[PDB]
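Ligand-bound model needed. magnesium ion.
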Amino acid sequence: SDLKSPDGNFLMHFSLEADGTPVYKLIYKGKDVIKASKLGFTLKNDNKSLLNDFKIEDTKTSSFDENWKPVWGEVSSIRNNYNELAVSLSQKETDRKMIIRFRLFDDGLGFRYEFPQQNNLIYFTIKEERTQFAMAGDHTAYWIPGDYDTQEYNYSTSKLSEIRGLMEKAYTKGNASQTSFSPTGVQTSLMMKSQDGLYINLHEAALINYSCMHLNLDDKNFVFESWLTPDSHGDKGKMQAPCKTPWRTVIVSDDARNILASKLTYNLNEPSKIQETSWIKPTKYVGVWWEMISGKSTWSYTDEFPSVQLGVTDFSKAKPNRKHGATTANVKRYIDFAAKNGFDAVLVEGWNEGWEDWIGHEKDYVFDFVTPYPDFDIKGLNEYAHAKKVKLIMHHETSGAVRNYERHMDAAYKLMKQYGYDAVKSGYVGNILPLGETHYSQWTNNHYQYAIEKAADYQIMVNAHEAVRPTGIARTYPNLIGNEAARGTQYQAFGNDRNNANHVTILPFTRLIGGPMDYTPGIFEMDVTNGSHVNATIANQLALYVTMYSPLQMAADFPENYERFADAFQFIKDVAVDWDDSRYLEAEPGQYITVARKAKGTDNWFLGNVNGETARVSNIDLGFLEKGKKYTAVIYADAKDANYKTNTQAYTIRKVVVTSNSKLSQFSASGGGYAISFYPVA
Amino acid sequence: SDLKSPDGNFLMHFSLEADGTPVYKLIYKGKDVIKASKLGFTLKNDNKSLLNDFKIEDTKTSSFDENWKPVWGEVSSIRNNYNELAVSLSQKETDRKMIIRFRLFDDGLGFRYEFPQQNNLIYFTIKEERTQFAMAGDHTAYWIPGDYDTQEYNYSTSKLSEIRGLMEKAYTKGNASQTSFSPTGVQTSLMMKSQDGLYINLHEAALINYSCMHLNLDDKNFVFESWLTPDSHGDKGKMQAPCKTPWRTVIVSDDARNILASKLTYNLNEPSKIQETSWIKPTKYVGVWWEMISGKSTWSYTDEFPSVQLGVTDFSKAKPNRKHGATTANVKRYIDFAAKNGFDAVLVEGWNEGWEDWIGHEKDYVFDFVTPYPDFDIKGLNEYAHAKKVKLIMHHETSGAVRNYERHMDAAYKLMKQYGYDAVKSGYVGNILPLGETHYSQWTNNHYQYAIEKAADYQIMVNAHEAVRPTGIARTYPNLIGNEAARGTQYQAFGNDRNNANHVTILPFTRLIGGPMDYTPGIFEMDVTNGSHVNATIANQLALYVTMYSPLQMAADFPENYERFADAFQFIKDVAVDWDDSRYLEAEPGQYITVARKAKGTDNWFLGNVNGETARVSNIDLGFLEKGKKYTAVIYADAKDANYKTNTQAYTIRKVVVTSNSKLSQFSASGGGYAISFYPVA
Ligand SMILES: OC[C@H]1O[C@H](OC[C@H]2O[C@H](O[C@H]3[C@H](O)[C@@H](O)[C@H](O)O[C@@H]3CO)[C@H](O)[C@@H](O)[C@@H]2O)[C@H](O)[C@@H](O)[C@@H]1O
Ligand SMILES: OC[C@H]1O[C@H](OC[C@H]2O[C@H](O[C@H]3[C@H](O)[C@@H](O)[C@H](O)O[C@@H]3CO)[C@H](O)[C@@H](O)[C@@H]2O)[C@H](O)[C@@H](O)[C@@H]1O
Ligand SMILES: [Ca+2]
Ligand SMILES: [Ca+2]
Ligand SMILES: [Mg+2]
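Prediction:
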């Protein structure tokens, strides 16, 4: 019946309605957070479905409290502490069995359904999940349109009752692959704030062998309902009992900072299944990349032909278009720059045959993932990098041809091992083939999961763009060091509205719940070749190495642009990519975030602040520093006249000595930020 | 404009209608065979398509005449001899380019379309092929319902005008996977006979990177029109220029025998791409097989569970159902029998975990193709077979889960090499996954092609059940040693109407055009465990080793049944499976076929006759024997009272000495036949 968090601040009441419908309710500090909300499923082709006519057959309670050491993360040790209530239901007429297991942490609630082995439910098809989250009122939400194919939108900040009105403007077009489902449909992770000051997050954890959950708002009664991603046949889960859904998560706090600090999502995922983890390596990198994204270079090698056919087109005899990014010469410039600046690795995109046809052609045999272009010396470059203690990050764009990638995967992973690539950036740009498939179906999520597991067997790290947004699986497979799976720094190069000034004050409350993002920060030249304008200050872009947590951190700009602001670049070079502790000092979604983190193995701290549309003075306590020690702090801040629109390169740098007793006050510009290194005094 | 066969008997006229529609016509010995028929395509999302407004830009004629040695076949040397006309078209308003290339052999016509590299047609989608074959009248046809998922039907013999009427009854239900498209749709290869004595076959050749062609009859004008197989999204070809369709084939003769003798289909496929072909091996085999098909055994190992989950179900601890066919003990019986009787191999089905769930569950992770059941000692059995100079044939049923098979394929092929399996029997039973895909789409055909190519790289032969019916590709990839892809001997065990008595007099005129069938002949006990009755006599079943040509010949029955009729079994033991010559002596589709073949490397001949509903005395010209030589003939015949319904086991055996000058005469029962070995006297 009743479940409480270990600290007593949460109560979850479970019951059945008069008609046997299962419902739950969640209360925080005596205030409704989830009102009476219904549970269960509509099945396809079924006499009854799983909405009602249950009775309670059994309940079991338990408790758990253990720590586990992540391979990489914000802390060196994570606490998994909950109470558990496991309700065994039996449906009348069908004798069908369905367990609903709840775990209630000090950060909030997670629940999921299990179907044990049974005689009258075996193979079955989910037509819709009917899992509800009834809100207590017309809350503020930070949201992006529900989509089966992209998450690449600007967030909207509005009341729940305003989402219908704002859907037309918020649903931005021009994407290679995007599909709407509802005038009131949004993605998770969904962030909200109530009128009475509660921060409420709705998400899921352990998305495996299942369809991605979106939410559909009933904007009359303020009920969000699970809405899963259809597959190529319109199905929302081919299930086989015994099976189990992913957890649904409600993360709550009266203090926005604790939302960011929460590990609930990881804690709901099963323990690492990789026994030996020292080959997984947090990575700071540059790449041949922004060149193409910002309109200076091509991924393609030749323009000679209407189309290309791998194994037929002789690229060694084709006319070079002279614009191609991934030349031996150019890849060497980025290696040189990485080695000189203490960076680990270098991404190269457009190294392989096929790029002439990579987008909008819905092509199956689009890449072989193994054959270099004639101007890219794979052997020499990997030798040259390795001699400079640098690695290349492999790039595997699939262009939606999942079968084609799967057939090539083994040989492509082997070619990585052969040359000493240990990490791959993968991509799923365009509609998934065959047409009618979606990016976030059960079918396609299986593929992303398969890529990761196989990667692991080869001791290869994965960072997967356009994949399903993460749900904590990195605990289980910590070689998933990244996803994009959200609107990244790249949209700052794509004109239109680029990224709103407060984007990076919302991502940590939404997309980062479930895992890190490859955000590709560190832009210093905001006015790029193709006319686009990045909406950030330099100090902003420095702070992202701390405020957008990731074991995979790019410095996305060109070496030349870093040489123009060497003094500011010092923070990017200094900052760590893995942490023993982390403290969120200030946070309010859509306005600002300020966080300090202790570099793993060290007594060094790195702090960042990111700030939204409204210029603001940030006031912090430096008592996270160790008592009795002096530290050199180097503050990289916005100039007073900086702004993300018309004065993006105005920064200051100053040195002052502080202790655990010190306070700090710092202006942040509109769309700006600050960054601090703290080194103990010698 | 005009094209002639090298012997003058065929004339094909090409032209444009006033509206620019391309059309062809075919004449044989002054008789219309193809009346004015239209060519081209309906494109998706294209106002104008490729139906008309062409003009002729160029024509090129040529000739070719060469022989080529197949690896395996009916003959030691095949003659490829045609005249070629290549018409280059250009569409007005679109500048689109389309070649139509015709080759005219002494056996008939093939043509296809090519799209060369061009500036205004790159990626495009075929909505329907618009290739016609206008008949001269209401011909007799031997046909099966048009289907995107099965060819496992009984043939119907009727007039073209009768097909609409007969469709309901001919479209038999109860198949795991079957989808109709038209009340007048039929499959190819389609056999016809005109009122005035022409044998007309309509088929295709080199079905690669393209959708399978069916025909839809307009039964008002007796025009058949290409009707391709939709994919999961309803498409009939995702094309990229430069590309090219398969050949469409019209094989004609005034003598039915020449239809069977024709190699036109092979001749239109490209030369072998396997350089070294001695590992490809015509194979006579038995197997643990019929036991399951005929209801005596299970593929499954246990009945203990509602469903199974690979990696989770512990089969070592499951309750054996003791019906399971593929035990070490039982597989040894068939090895012992193969070795003792000069057979090459032993198929085993149900050797691997998963079989509890193999049919109609639409299960993805249905098999791993590597993990033996706990009662099948893969190592001991392969050692034991090899030490008795026998091989096992691997069985890979996919149960429609193509992605699952593809992911497992490399390791499954490796496990074959590890234990000395060199041939695999594959299967595609149930709907293709994901749901909505078809068996004979471009997408799925790509999969069958991929299996074969990869098989070749491992030096593995492939025999694929429920795959697309063959179109001559074995020339190009002679490791494709068979397909089922029609109604096989198995339906003789499936009750209902089993196989019509004259089935095996139709298959050579239809399904065998394009490649051999694994028909699994050689039944001696016709009344099997589950009550079903095989509609053949014993002499019939001996004759199939010659009248259903295959480099892969099964003796389907149980060793016990062969040991009981050892005298008759002698033919199965003696007969060869590869040939240096073949002569079709008599043939009439749906009535009889009589053919004699010379065993490769030998002076031995083997003759078979199969006979339809009507009992018939056959008169055999033995002029194919070498002049002035004496031969021992052993005739295995129907007794005079034999009959496929009520007296299936009454056979005689006599020896007589013959020469090329002998003519001898033999009764064949209703659904019966005869078989003869010819050995030169010592
Ligand atoms: O692997 C290469 C590249 O792939 C991903 O980025 C590709 C990105 O391309 C398109 O973006 C278009 C924008 O949506 C429009 O709004 C803009 O107008 O034009 C761009 C350029 O095509 C796709 O539509 C989009 O879905 C896709 O993500 C990786 O994220 C990137 O880092 C890679 O380098
Ligand atoms: O690898 C297993 C087996 O697969 C193929 O044959 C399987 C065959 O199974 C079904 O046949 C059914 C018939 O449709 C019904 O008419 C009959 O009554 O019952 C049987 C079994 O339910 C599928 O429906 C059918 O499409 C499929 O081809 C191979 O051909 C065989 O050799 C293999 O051993
Ligand atoms: Ca992207
Ligand atoms: Ca079959
Ligand atoms: Mg400037």
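The pocket of magnesium ion (ligand 5) is lined by residues A 527 (CB under 6 Å).
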